Design a protein around this ligand. Structure first.
Ligand SMILES: CCCCCCCCCCCCCCCC(=O)O
Ligand SMILES: CCCCCCCCCCCCCCCC(=O)O
Lengths: 281, 235, 278, 281, 235, 278, 281, 60
């Protein structure tokens, strides 16, 4: 084969070769409306899809809850005080005690699912601030102990719907007798050790209180595996960090609440058995 | 002569390279092959032949015929499992030395559907039923019939046919599983319970025995050949 | 090859009962997952190519270690040339891989890897050595001195390896007198007749000249230096174009010699495990 | 030759290239019937066949006894007491003093033959047990001395029709003056040193007293050679091991007899001469 | 230049490799070949030429003309064999040094049909008969005419023609036989007996002599060239 | 080639009597097994390819060992370059294989394998040596010193071998002045005439210049080191494209020199064996 | 060139490439008859032929005597006593003082010729013996001195028509002052050092007194050279050895005579000059 | 890269081998040949020219 600028393959094995404001969306029995939402982000431009047999690893017939699990669950609300650094919720670990989705993911061994995350935070025309919502895939976070690595515990690494928080400054877990085994992600490093500024490479939106009060993210199912355990592996992760601090009428104690509404989409399960009863506290 | 340039990787002996070498016995006439019964054209063909699972690798029975017998009884119905074993065909101590396990221990990846058969070597008047359950990993291992049924299960009637097949399907997040007892690539659990106790008439033996068998299904496969730890050349 | 696709299946209520079988016959159950479970369609990509006989045996394995020295001319001790009878039963791993099957026709590929080292504390000089590796078929004279006529290799094939170059290598066709190598042989080479001395006709069990392939003699061509130099040739054997017949169960206990014997204390392969314990 | 994923052969020599219950069967003047025999096993799916000239090594005209030697000979019977570990008969060494087949194999130098082995053992509906009959090809067995290898004698390695037995536990032949040169095959190791569980790779059947009382095996002629001496090389070997021990009505002394009926099939001979008179006792 | 990669087996001298080498006498004009009678195109052609078998390698006769003579007589008929020899053409001391044996000792495998001829170098009035028997291995060697006849045999009449040919067929379990005296690959036995004693009239010599001859048949073949032990370069 | 198939045969009662022949004529009996025995049809696979003349001679054989040293400049002893007259009668195995036949036309392939070693107890240093192997045809001047004009190889072909690399090798066509190499020559080179001195015309029996191929001179190009280094070139000769004529009986007793002479005590080749003993 | 099991030649030179009783025959004015001669041997199946120009080395016009030299010359007769080991005559050295053939071979420098050798020896039906006549090409013979090699003299190595004899046992020529330089060929070794038994590879016949009394050999011209000097090189050589000793009526002194009759055939000569007068005694 | 195998006879200088070698003067313009009388195309052409035989190689 004479290629343009003589390529002959001598080895059978291949490895040996050479080198917009208005929005209303309905999922099941749940409906979401937002008159000042600045469009949606289809993360990586891929809508969630059911597993296709062409790339199907397991054989067992999949149980798709459909309406009973592809609903919008509103996680708890969090106050965005002036001196707040951020929050992070891992998925689907957040939807583990939410309706029938939690039951299905605990009962079934393997499970895949996309998500639709709607972050809601509204302020008056006289408020001043801006949030950034990033859907970090495979979101890891740094530990708190400099004497050990990858030492975080299951209970502390999976807060649930309560979520987690970013700390302004790192603080080693100096306790050498009973280490807390707890995440200590620095806000500007984003926890992973990278920089916040570059974090925009991830699928993201910005809730700028002057322009929009909502942020919609359609997160597909990204994973090295077509289907994987939901109780072990947390595919995505939502991180909400305030790019610019809240401010209002020269008032030093302004608070506004931020809410999340997550809807599993095209969620499929396999491998039914006794129900997982994990230790979380 | 022709100008060449020895690239890196020259004058090395790689023990997995298919390179032509000069013949040391030129013109050597070769005895023609003959049709010998039983030509095996793939190692998987051996993995698909049933072989008894030494279930009772406990104390006395270990390394004796008794290790192949699972003893049932005529006791009143109970939920305690008759037998239990993790689906680690290459590292499970019971499945490690079966033909399937022996073939697997030469490869580091395996992916397919297993076939657990059970034969009831008991009297003709011993009738009953059993529950053979496979529960994928990620939860509490079954310890009572209450939890085992929730997974895959088959109800075996011991009336006339002495055997029952449970096809353990391929449930895995990864496309392959390591042949080492591993936390991430666990296989699951398999257990046998009494659904309905064995009932034997009078003047009949009151202690049955069931023999296991493990084989690969027609979709099985392995890759990444490796060495086996079952054999050591002492000194 | 693309393994069979895992076809779809659904609820059924028939009376074929493929799940139940009888192991009394010698036929294994061809049952498949679709029969006993609700199965979804799955396009199959996995192939059994890596597990074929060639791919299972397409790797050279050490079969011996031959020690040959070049004692200093100062010491009167004669040179040590190594005569190794050809066989794959010196090691275990290749032997165990082959003894899965009962018969085998395979071309062979032998590779010789040589190494050397000084022995005397005196850090002397030894010029690059040349090793002769001569194949003595069954019957040809066995060299008795490192410098006798038999080393002329008039008919015996031989390789001259210049230490420090690429390891020696040569291929060989199927040389079995029979139509397949006999890994196992249940019988004798003599039958003790009722009308002769007991000694006559006494032959080792399961020993036959089917595996009689002659010897391999390795020597250091260089005449002795003032400093002794030892060397160890390693022979790596790769079966090519291998066909095997009549599978068997792999060895479970450690080997003991060429036969199928096992030593007294080696008869405990399995490991402790409670019956009801995951 | 450009093969799919440039293969050029440079060396003339090829080695240098790169890589059901009811059964009734009649043989000659002998007939066998069994109303509860669970079908037959054609070992390796090859029916015995006469030597084909396309693969014929010797030239001498072959003597095929046909009816006079392809008959069913019933070897002696053996009691299957509760504490019995197994039995093994080597073929054709078993049929050495059976009718004209023994005479033909002793007179003729070379001889090939397939076999049809019918193992018969019947018990009441109230009996409990199971045998496994394996037709081990090239069946070798371990010696009794740890100080020597391959030291077994011809007389002890060829019991005849009496057969041999498997011992529960290994016992070295400590006698260093006059070694017994006798097989000591451990039952669970099958003698060869392998494991019994894997022994199912060999052609086999199971006589489960609840289901069937007979086992038929059609063993072809497998050997590295088209035709080979019958007095030296024992091609096949039958091993009967009780997978589950006999039991009956809580009785601690239950016995049932097991019988073998072997029929040479397509047996051919060559090389006639003085009759072999071997030393066997 | 071109990128290459020296595989294992480079820079080695294998004494059985057909590799082109530069000519040290370029353009050298070559004397043309001429038709010289007796061109041999295969070593087997030499194995097919009869050569006397030194039968009587005993004591005095050894290494003397007498070793080629087998002495018959006019004695009354007896069953004791006239002569005996194992069919080990390459290792039998009598057949080792015959042309067939000499050619064989350069190869380690042989397979074919042999041709033993016998010539009766006696008087014209000496008439009789002999039995030339070949008995394959695996039994007691023949020692009387009673046992020899049961194998292959030919009855040689010594009336007019002085010669008799016994074609020893190819009876072997293996497709080839080793050229070393071996227990597994034995060849068999060959013997000559009196069927009917030699009867000589009066005034006639009473001690005949028969000369043997051994050759290969047209189906013979050898392989796996080796060295010969018949020649040693002392020191 | 597929040898003739062993055709079938059955009982016969004719009077052709092919079994009986007469050895008095010089024609061997073409009898075949089917004639004297009931023979079964057999498809023939065996071939005589391995036994052809090429396959019988297609293997290099050592024909000489040439010793060349590089004495230390400290010792005044001159260098030792080796002059070896070309011939295959130094060894036995190749000579014995060739002396089956009377005449032979074969191209030749010579391979030189060199080895070196220190001799003085002083473990000194010697840089890699370069050997010159020069062919001196019959008549060309014979080098007398290791550093004289004759080594210029202006017309004599020569090989420069750098010790430690692949052994040297070169091919040569048929160089015989006659139309075939004369392994044996019954005659002389001079006829002693009746009218001249006895000394004149006296030539060795069976000696002729048909086997006059010149000499081969090997030297160490490197000028002497401070430490003596000995070396031994081995010449392996492979006949290619060989044709042979007029077979003969192979030698039975050990050789003695170039001729067909045998020594006094070597005339006992055969071995003891009773007439009636299997 | 892709040959069957890529052969490319890189070097111009070819050496660099990789790898019956009744007989009556008339020659000239001579006729030979034999009523009990067992056919003839055309040694190597090649009848003598005149030199063909396609393989003609010299240019000079060849002198073919034809009838004057292609006649049957009867060499002297020799008694075959019981204790006689054999005889050997070298050719054409035997026909050096025979008629015009001797004159032609002495006058001409180069000469080629085939031969027809008729060995005649007749005995009664009551005689017992057998001769073997071998036409050894390039027949060399071993010397008598172990202290020297190839030391035989021209006079002793060319007996003429008298021929030579084989000695039963070797005897070194211990005389170190004036070595005899004489052949000492041992009978069973055939002189060359080979064995007598293998000597049948040469063209040969057997004169078995029970069957035939004559032996005819048609020897072509075999030599490395198309034409060669006849006074130096003796192409062929006849060796007559008694395979079985003579015996007659229990008489310990039986003698019969053996005669040779040699006829040059297709004899050609070149290079005429002064006549060779060699020293022979 | 391509798999090769150095056969015996490598890295040796044989003084009778016709092997191509790199040019040390690339693009070097060559003076064209001209018809010079007396071109000899074979050494035999010289052997065929008569030359006096020094017959009397004796003493003086
Ligand atoms: C040492 C240089 C030349 C070597 C020539 C080839 C050596 C091997 C020839 C015999 C191999 C036959 C036995 C191998 C297979 C087996 O034993 O299973
Ligand atoms: C040493 C480098 C150059 C060598 C050139 C080739 C040397 C051999 C030339 C003469 C060979 C002729 C004799 C060989 C055959 C024989 O004697 O039978």
């Amino acid at each position: 084969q004479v290629s343009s600028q003589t390529t002959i393959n001598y080895y059978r094995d291949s490895a040996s070769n050479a080198a917009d404001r208005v929005l209303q969306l309905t999922l099941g029995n749940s409906t979401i409306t937002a008159q000042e939402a600045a469009n949606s982000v289809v993360a990586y431009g891929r809508w969630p899809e059911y597993l296709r047999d062409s790339e199907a690893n397991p054989v067992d017939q999949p149980t798709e809850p459909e309406v009973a699990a592809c609903r919008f669950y509103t996680l708890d609300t969090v106050s965005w005080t002036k001196e707040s650094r951020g929050w992070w919720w891992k998925l689907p670990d957040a939807l583990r005690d939410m309706g029938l989705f939690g039951q299905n993911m605990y009962y079934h061994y393997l499970g895949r699912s996309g998500y639709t995350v709607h972050v809601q935070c509204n302020a008056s025309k006289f408020h001043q601030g801006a949030l950034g919502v990033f859907a970090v895939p495979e979101m890891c976070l740094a530990g708190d102990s400099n004497t050990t690595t990858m030492h975080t515990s299951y209970q502390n690494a999976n807060p649930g719907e309560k979520g987690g928080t970013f700390t302004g400054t790192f603080t080693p877990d100096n306790n050498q007798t009973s280490p807390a085994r707890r995440f200590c992600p620095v806000d500007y490093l984003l926890g992973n050790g990278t920089l916040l500024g570059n974090a925009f490479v991830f699928p993201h939106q910005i809730i700028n209180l002057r322009t929009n009060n909502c942020a919609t993210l359609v997160l597909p199912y990204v994973n090295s595996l077509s289907i994987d355990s939901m109780v072990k592996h947390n595919n995505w992760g939502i991180a909400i960090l305030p790019l610019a601090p809240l401010n209002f009428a020269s008032e030093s104690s302004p608070e506004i609440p931020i809410t999340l509404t997550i809807a599993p989409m095209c969620c499929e399960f396999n491998g039914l058995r006794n129900i997982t009863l994990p230790r979380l506290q | 002569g022709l100008p060449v340039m020895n690239t890196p990787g020259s004058n090395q002996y790689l023990t997995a390279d298919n390179f032509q070498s000069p013949c040391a016995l030129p013109e050597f006439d070769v005895t023609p092959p003959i049709d010998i019964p039983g030509e095996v054209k793939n190692m998987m063909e051996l993995a698909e032949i049933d072989t008894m699972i030494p279930f009772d690798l406990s104390a006395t029975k270990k390394n004796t015929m008794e290790m192949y017998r699972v003893r049932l009884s005529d006791k009143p119905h109970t939920d305690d499992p008759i037998l239990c074993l993790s689906l680690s065909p290459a590292s499970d101590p019971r499945l490690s030395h079966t033909m399937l396990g022996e073939i697997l221990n030469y490869y580091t990846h395996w992916a397919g559907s297993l076939k657990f058969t059970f034969m009831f070597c008991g009297s003709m008047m011993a009738t009953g039923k059993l529950l053979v359950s496979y529960a994928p990993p990620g939860a509490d291992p079954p310890k009572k019939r209450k939890e085992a049924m929730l997974g895959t299960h088959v109800i075996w009637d011991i009336g006339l046919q002495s055997s029952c097949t449970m096809v353990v399907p391929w449930i895995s997040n990864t496309t392959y599983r390591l042949t080492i007892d591993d936390s991430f690539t666990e296989g699951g659990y398999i257990s046998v319970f009494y659904q309905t106790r064995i009932v034997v008439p009078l003047s009949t033996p009151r202690e049955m025995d069931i023999l296991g068998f493990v084989s690969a299904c027609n979709d099985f496969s392995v890759r990444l050949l490796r060495d086996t730890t079952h054999i050591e050349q002492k000194a | 090859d693309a393994l069979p696709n895992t076809e779809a299946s659904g609820p059924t209520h028939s009376k074929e009962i493929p799940a139940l079988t009888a192991v009394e016959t010698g036929a294994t159950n061809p049952l498949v997952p679709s029969d006993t479970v609700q199965t979804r369609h799955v396009v199959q990509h996995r192939s059994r190519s890596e597990s074929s006989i060639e791919s299972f045996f397409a790797r050279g394995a050490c079969v011996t270690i031959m020690t040959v020295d070049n004692p200093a001319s100062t010491t009167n001790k004669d040179k040590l040339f190594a005569v190794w009878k050809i066989t794959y039963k010196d090691t275990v791993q290749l032997r165990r891989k082959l003894e899965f099957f009962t018969y085998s026709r395979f071309d062979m590929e032998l590779t010789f890897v040589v190494t050397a080292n000084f022995t005397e504390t005196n850090n002397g000089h030894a010029l690059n050595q040349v090793y002769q590796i001569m194949y003595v078929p069954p019957g040809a004279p066995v060299p008795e001195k490192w410098d006798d006529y038999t080393w002329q290799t008039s008919s015996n094939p031989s390789i001259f390896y210049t230490y420090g170059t690429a390891p020696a290598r040569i291929s060989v066709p199927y040389v079995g007198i029979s139509n397949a190598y006999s890994h196992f042989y249940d019988g004798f080479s003599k039958v003790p007749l009722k009308d002769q001395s007991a000694a006559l006709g006494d032959s080792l069990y399961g020993a036959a000249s089917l595996n009689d392939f002659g010897i391999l003699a390795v020597r250091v061509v260089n005449d002795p230096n003032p400093t002794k130099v030892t060397s160890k040739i390693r022979v790596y054997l790769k079966p090519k174009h291998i066909r095997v017949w009549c599978p068997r169960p792999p060895r479970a206990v450690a080997y003991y010699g060429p036969g199928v014997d096992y030593k007294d204390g080696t008869l405990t392969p399995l490991s402790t495990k409670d019956l009801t314990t995951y």
